[PDB]
Amino acid sequence: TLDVCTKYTIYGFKGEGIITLTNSSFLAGVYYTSDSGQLLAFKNVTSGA
Amino acid sequence: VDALIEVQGTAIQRILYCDDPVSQLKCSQVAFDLDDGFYPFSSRNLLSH
């Protein structure tokens, strides 16, 4: 569910927070993280999201 | 082969091989260009194995 604070667990990475949508398309990567290893960004290949 | 890599928002470019002694030098300083000056270097010890 989108744009709401919730408990999540994605690919073995989990926490509590608000998922959000951006538009910055990138031709490489399904996921991304902070340099601190905090998994901020991730991609959706099927939808392009 | 070892070389430096640039990533530009999931776009790579400006790649130079590290298959040369002085290039391996520039590779050691990970700088596309270096200022003149004094730098301490190792002896070439890659003659025979």
Ligand SMILES: *[C@@H]1O[C@H](CO)[C@@H](O[C@@H]2O[C@H](CO)[C@@H](O[C@@H]3O[C@H](CO[C@H]4O[C@H](CO)[C@@H](O)[C@H](O)[C@@H]4O)[C@@H](O)[C@H](O[C@H]4O[C@H](CO)[C@@H](O)[C@H](O)[C@@H]4O)[C@@H]3O)[C@H](O)[C@H]2NC(C)=O)[C@H](O)[C@H]1NC(C)=O
């Ligand atoms: C990245 O994010 C995208 C976007 O969410 C994910 O892809 C979507 O996945 C969801 C399900 O997880 C899909 O949602 C459904 O899509 C229907 C239309 O899309 C097709 O897919 C369904 C099966 O889901 C087919 O049966 C259908 O014929 C379509 O051809 C919507 O119509 C759905 O709503 C319907 O179903 C729900 C229950 O599921 C009902 O409650 C509704 O009332 C309605 O009847 C539903 O929304 C979505 O289609 C997917 N989109 C794409 C583009 O694939 C990715 O999986 C995710 N990850 C990656 C890596 O991309």
Ligand SMILES: *[C@@H]1O[C@H](CO)[C@@H](O)[C@H](O)[C@H]1NC(C)=O
């Ligand atoms: C969403 O799309 C708009 C329309 O071009 C754009 O201005 C905005 O930057 C996009 N959001 C992103 C890239 O996070």
